[PDB]
Symmetry: C2
Subunit: 127 residues, 2 copies
């Protein structure tokens, strides 16, 4: 009942795919679960997969892995959404600059954040 | 580079699928990302999808959503692995009985846990 879904950055065409941005035809002779796994783990197809976190920002925008958010604070910081296996969580990684926050990523702490770009479509936000 | 993968409980055949337990043929006229999303969200196919957490138990067994673990403690408790959207995390939900733990789900806290069953293949562990 939780939404499980992904967006993809196509490294060949420099394009983010959510639904039908791109066309295709997939064919596999395996079950649904094995199919998802095969696709997710085909690195040479040139798609980078990013998972929807299950949280929405200040504006109802769905927050994905690889998103860059700001705390609608008047503050100078930028954060990157990362999944960290070792804490089995999505969390914020500081991109800029004062490295002091950012608490747990949760429904409370994102109530005043905004998605501003992501690490693929917005290199101007990087480093 | 983090492993993203799923297992599925087939509600029609009462069987857990990881790789080739089940056969099939999938066909879609869309891109990889849209394909994964379609499959994940087809409830009427009768697969319940469960995500790999990114953590392994005391024995190197990979921990999934829906797993039932014990703390290799001599303790009486059982926990269920759940994903909670609102904290964008996998966490333990107490199944039995003394409701007092269980800290964050992380590489430290599972170093002494063991996967014992899951909420589908092990109804004897439930409630």
């Amino acid at each position: 009942n939780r939404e499980v879904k992904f967006r993809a950055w196509d490294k060949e065409l420099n394009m983010m795919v959510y639904t039908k941005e791109q066309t295709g035809h997939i064919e596999y002779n395996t079950n649904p679960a094995d199919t998802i796994n095969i696709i997710l783990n085909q690195d040479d197809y040139g798609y980078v997969f990013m998972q929807y976190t299950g949280l929405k920002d200040k504006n109802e925008k769905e927050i994905y892995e690889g998103d860059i958010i700001k705390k609608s604070n008047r503050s100078s910081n930028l954060y990157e959404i990362i999944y960290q296996d070792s804490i089995a969580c999505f969390r914020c990684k500081v991109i800029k600059g004062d490295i002091k926050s950012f608490p747990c990523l949760n429904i409370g702490t994102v109530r005043n954040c905004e998605v501003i770009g992501n690490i693929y479509e917005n290199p101007e936000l990087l480093e």
